[model samples]
Target: SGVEGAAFQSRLPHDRMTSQEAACFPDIISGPQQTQKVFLFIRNRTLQLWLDNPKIQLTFEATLQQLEAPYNSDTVLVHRVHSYLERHGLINFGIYKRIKPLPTKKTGKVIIIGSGVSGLAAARQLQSFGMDVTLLEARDRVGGRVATFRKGNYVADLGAMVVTGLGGNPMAVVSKQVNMELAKIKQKCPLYEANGQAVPKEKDEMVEQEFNRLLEATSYLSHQLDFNVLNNKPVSLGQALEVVIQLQEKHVKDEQIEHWKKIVKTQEELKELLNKMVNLKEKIKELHQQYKEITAEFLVKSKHRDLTALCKEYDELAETQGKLEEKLQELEANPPSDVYLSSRDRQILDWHFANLEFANATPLSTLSLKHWDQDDDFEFTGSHLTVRNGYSCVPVALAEGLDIKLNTAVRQVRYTASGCEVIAVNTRSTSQTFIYKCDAVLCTLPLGVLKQQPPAVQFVPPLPEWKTSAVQRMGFGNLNKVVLCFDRVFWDPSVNLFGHVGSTTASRGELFLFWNLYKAPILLALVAGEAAGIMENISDDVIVGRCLAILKGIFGSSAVPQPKETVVSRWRADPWARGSYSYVAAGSSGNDYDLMAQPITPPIPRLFFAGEHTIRNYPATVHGALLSGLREAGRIADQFLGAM
Candidate 1:
């Protein structure tokens, strides 16, 4: 394993990097109004400092001024001039924590999977815990989605475009612990300009109505089953919703509860409850798996011709469940004449219930203790921010000492009583089954990767029904992010020109979604929903032509030169990273989620999980993955917490 190069890692402690030792400051919005002031501020500073090198000196001053803007409205223009003012290969990315690993102990081994921020943080903790820990990464790099790429003179981070939740992010805490400057983007949009006027194809009024309809449907369902209902077998969201509608239709007013159902008070509170009820957790996986396989087929059969036949299955299944419960009651009353462990089991059971609620408290963290749905007005999710270089730095920082076999396609993870074996062929090399045996395997492969290529595993004991079903039901969407770096600034420096892209645009092609990002001279575009998958098949020129036309409209039509350099990241099509992030479909329930997060620990308890897919706190976030890795390591480290 190689240690990190000193050129990059910082040595300063938590309080000495500020240009001024001054403590406090205020916040500003990164909008157009703020853009002018920020631009002026930087112009003045840069002009005065780098006035001598007039050839391209203006760019350096602009770069320093914009990058150093006090408000988020400021930015370093990334035109061809960027190469001239190239300074240190700085990062728009940062680490969540600066925690040095605690010395490892001799008693146990902790393994962390996925080099994203979450996994890395966990590794640091395990290191501090002093347990022998080996970090494993599926990618050749440590930072999962936080990789920074080299762009000419400066470094660009393409992964995560933001470092948000600063007020309470652990990365912020660690930044302070170590001496690193924190730059806040003003909430103001500086140079605001869209190609042309934005006209909504769907009225805001219509969108609002649709939102209301969604809520109404949700409220109706809640009035019936509520979260208290135990649905064991998994079902597709579409089918689940259909079945729910059918149930409501059959019961009308009778099935609904007399009173309104209480929404979950806190995510943390619920996650803790889940970690406690092991039986419930197992059922969740079973249900999720059942839905993926059984429900999908049912849906296919019922497609128009099939109707909502799920109801028939539901009724029969309910009857079978009742019989099983009765049989369980009889067994408890009489016992199996010869088999008996219920006595010792009773004392253990008592302890389990007593402490179940608090077992997840540590892993849940403090910030997640509130209901996400409580704030209707708060824009907590529409977070947007990106470093000029990209988000690669975060992963690189965490990926220290991890061996990543890139381009190696692992077919499956075969689980044995003692450990795990992965069967896969080298994609970049000969198609050979390179077997790897370890005490445990921390799988960090993407859901899409797994879906496209099933790991051929020889199971001593096959997975249960829930396990199989959950794997099938977990959904992966097709979202494409198309970022274009043009050769020159060929757009009007004014106008909020972004509008309804796609079919309605002047040149209806898959180019930069809209001619935006004039502030830094780089025009970017985004395509989500159902349109992303199609972009993968279309030619880049076709997409570029549309963007070029949009830019021509915003700027003078005469300003018609394309970008000198182009970089395309089809994350949607990337086999390694399926969808950009994991999302919870509405109404899968806590059970489906519970199964998704459970570790596939074999007999020896070595196969642990560490990724956004495996944890709940920040679930679909870097922090969540890092916490997951650390959490698993802590459990493994329990064997030597003190002595280590």
Candidate 2:
């Protein structure tokens, strides 16, 4: 009753069954009549089926004997049933015919290393799917890099503080789930000079405009070059910016020269006008003498002709002299000159540069020019938000109802085609070791940890060349915070944030950005790029003194007071995380992130990876880590339940 076509075939055992077995079973058919069609044909001792639903167009072969056979080991039947369920939107109903020798047990067990946001998220998702998930955390508490420190009424986030973008960010969803309050960071970040004076509004705006123009030009230059052609000759973000800056400097010099020429021309014109005025004055004197002599001669000798012409000549000369004097004065009053950036303008620009470095957690020299802003277009909309109760609340809420083993540091991970075995030692008690065996392992360790020389966590049989290379190519950097609490607010209270222009280029990122804690007399100073690394070795008291010196430079020495309390983050020295977060380094592209995200599947995908570094669209962010975990969880689910 349907259109006859060539019989489809497959390599499955059931599809390849002989005609002798086909005779044992009857033809099976199911579908609506005419409009939607499904037919199973067993003619010619072969099995074939055609599906022609208006919404689905597929053709394949399967034996009726196999479909009707009890406890058949036909994976093809399972796949077909899954396909049918997916097409009808019934996959979530968990309906499927049972078969012998399941690839994995009904309840899969997953071992997730690191109780960070990514690990917590993966464990929760897998557990929801009826999988036994356990998270091993090196630290005693959850939220590895999202830590918070509380001191009485003062609360400070030692790690991540801001949820960058609210829209489409997974962290925002978690915040809503926990019913946490999110305070939006104000956009007004006033900049101050090294001399404790706020930069003029117009001057600040003009310098900011010039700086943005340079950045735009850099972007244009980056697009002009083919990265593949210049693979060996990689361009750094600093190099690109330097190129644009030099070009702008040349333009400014040219304008200055032009302005100098105009000023010289004006001076020459003024000299000529003065010379004419002098000549006109002498002529007027002679004309006045002539007019008096002519009048006296006319009055005495009555024979002189009319003096009207002589008088008219004198008046015209006097008028010309007056006009020449006025022109000379006007020329001298207004002089031509070129506009140049002052020292204050340069200071503001330095402040802006430091802000950029803090954002990327890396210096400009190492940042990739081609791939630095690869995720810019995908950035979520809306202002960045800060949590009212500290960032740790997020992981705490996510860790609820999940099995997480605190102080359990994974020492080694050995994964094979069958399963994964993890060896861990309790940090609290180094003498004790725990071995965990699970169907799959999700490694959510930070990139910094993976990049450690003499690797912190050993991988049995070692990772492949590509994975190790990806780990090496990507850059992990640091951005540390120095939270200071004062007896009273010394800085401006109206603005939420402010900037301190560095005295030298080398120390530009040292105490550049200051965030005034809302409703508290506390300030958070960020040390980024090389400054952060240097600060790690310095003592806490010395660091606090340096921060106070910078503050004094901005707020005057006497006006600033000593901090009553201080907390600093040293992420680099920390054993769990060697540094802060990952960035697309010079000579590396977004492809490296994709490589890091790839699961190690010898024949079966036994090992999975999840972290902020594993994702390209939202790297170096809390939401990125959360989304990566969700993605891996889906992948693991598909591995067990067939593709959904």
Candidate 3:
């Protein structure tokens, strides 16, 4: 599965290749039952063939076909064929034979711009192909989006926190290699009232019921959009929501319209009951008149117990009628705009919107609902993995032994078929310039940076219109994190997370979801979408204070205490990374991801692009960035060594 092609020439001696590599390409003819015997026969014969002929070629399919002519080795061909093509070569980030790297004459160093995961992965892979690699990093650190901040002896991820989902994820492999301890991101959520009280049980139940409905509604919408986009008729998420709302209303009304009318009439009738009770009062008045003096004397003597009770009952009914009338009046004045969603449903929608803002880091109107969870199949594992130390370990581990230059930013790249020139300036010293002439270059600048007017890096002849348009069409969004290191753990630690439901008018994108750090007294708050951009423009203290105010709303009355330290990301403010990641915008076709990933056209072959924005299946992810790097590197290596 790790290697792509089903065909292979096992011409080399058995000793040259490991058993695992040999196993990857299964013997098609010989069954698994006969694998041991067939493998032994082939190994001995393979050695003899190498010595005698020195030019014999053997593919697993051909060898198995020859071996099975006499006695069929009942191999499980169906299943083997089923699993063979899922992932292949370095693209999978899975285990593969460290190929006997073919030797190559050093033509020129491959200058890799940016030392992020993609840049580092590409550089390392190129070096293995016997190419001299020079990695240039604009920042002082290596991990691009996977940033870890240290506070009070504890490390917190201020950039990319979770290994979103495991399986086929290259970052997971790096985590294991680096001995990074990982824990399940056990998630628990708590809904709060505006006053910081846990939502009342009755309202909570109503919200929970509608929340499930909302999930179903949104999930179905995504699937429908996916089909539409596949058919080349892409639709905006907002328009899709409108359609779903209409359908929901129709279904609910069709089922409950009669019932709703009955309830409405019953409410009106109940309110009118108080006004209709005059006839009973008149009957009492007549009785009082008939025995007026006698009743007065008896009532004075008996304290008029029965009369007093009747008056109290009448007063109670009047109050109930008044309250019912008020309720009916309120409904008449402010009728529900959406008959399908209850008052509770609207709140759940707001909550879901807030969470969505974090997931895509884009507004609901901007995201392409069709491609919302396109990467779900890529996730082999269900839960997100959170490492104890930080996400920095993965990039650091992959970058081991690779040549990387820090504090050097590539400002311009000029390329031709024969050679390429890269002009870099020291980030710390703008006046100091460095020029590098190279055989080829891999550019891994973020889409946010690439979209900058007069982009961060200038191409001598300017990039092709297609490439620039792809970069422009792709939406770049910002997501920031504010890690507050408190003196002690004051918030709920039983659950992994808590949420603050802000006012109706509040954007509340930032600091709504707080992840509790048990190892230390740190609470990590994620600020996403426009909120993150706004926060980036403001002062750190202002942001920190806002986060503190949110926490105080939940755990107030007693002093929750201010944070001893605070760490906030400046992704939006940073020149190297204008935003956090990329999203497929409403107007752009989904294929833009593929367009951005394409390497420069042939004649030159001196430039390549690698970054999360350039990936299709797994864009805006840590592993996606890493895998994109390996892909470009393989493309470059394919030119030097014959194709696989």
Best by lDDT: 2
For all candidates in order, the CA lDDT equals 0.43, 0.73, 0.68
RMSD of 1: 28.4
For candidate 2, list the clashing residue pairs, or say none. none
lDDT (tens digit, per residue) of candidate 2 on 18-99? 3422332223222233211222222211222222221112222233343443313444544554343222212211111223
* TM-score of candidate 1 versus the correct structure, residues matched by position: 0.53
Runs off by more than 4 Å, candidate 3: 1-108, 200-212, 218-234, 246-345, 602-604
Estimated TM-score for each candidate:
0.53, 0.75, 0.72
lDDT of 3 by residue, 142-257 (tens): 98888887655778887787776554345554665567777777666786645676766576567566655655676675765443453464665645665666777797777566
Error of 1 at 55 (Å): 40
Measured with C-alpha atoms, the lDDT of residue 355 in candidate 3 is: 70
Clashing pairs in 3: 31-73, 31-75
